Design a protein around this ligand. Structure first.
Ligand code: A1ILV
Length: 148
């Protein structure tokens, strides 16, 4: 269930940014902690990198996937993995969602689940083993970022 858990975190973050809460039992405790930390990092990246983010047009899910993979390959190229870098992946997906909502040439809600897929694929394939060895999401991420 490793991929599915990360896909659900990425989808919950996307629904948070788009302000489209899905009814039912709601997000898990990991998801709730992740949403505040990643949103804080997202607003900081948006502010600092506004000029260069504004020069790019996210016109399709293919462009979002390509930009996500190029930016995240560079973010992790030195071989270091830490929780802050993992929170930045979610923050970056939130930026791409916002730009896609503004500039997607043929708007399609069913294409938003493609973003949660390519975020989960990157996390699983590049950081999954480190995540497990550092406590997973409940004994690693939550313990580190939950309120004291
Ligand atoms: C001003 C930087 C820039 O041109 N790009 C960019 C690089 C990295 C980045 O975010 C990561 C995560 C937070 C930071 N630690 C760095 C955001 C923007 C562009 C990269 C290109 C030129 C494509 O390689 C860029 C611009 C706009 C978008 Cl939507 C994506 C990437």
């Amino acid at each position: 269930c490793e991929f599915g858990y990360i896909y659900r975190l990425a989808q919950d973050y996307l629904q948070c940014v788009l302000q489209i809460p899905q009814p039912g039992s709601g997000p898990s405790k990991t998801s709730r902690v992740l949403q505040n930390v990643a949103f804080s990092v997202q607003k900081e990246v948006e502010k600092n990198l506004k000029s260069c983010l504004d020069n790019v047009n996210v016109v399709s899910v293919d462009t979002a996937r390509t930009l996500f993979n190029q930016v995240m390959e560079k973010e992790f190229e030195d071989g270091i993995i830490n929780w802050g870098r993992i929170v930045t992946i979610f923050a970056f997906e939130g930026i791409l969602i916002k730009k896609l909502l503004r500039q997607q040439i043929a708007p399609d809600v069913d294409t938003y689940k493609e973003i949660s897929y390519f975020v989960a694929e990157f996390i699983m394939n590049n950081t999954g083993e480190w995540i497990r060895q550092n406590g997973g999401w409940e004994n690693g991420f939550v313990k580190k970022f939950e309120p004291k």
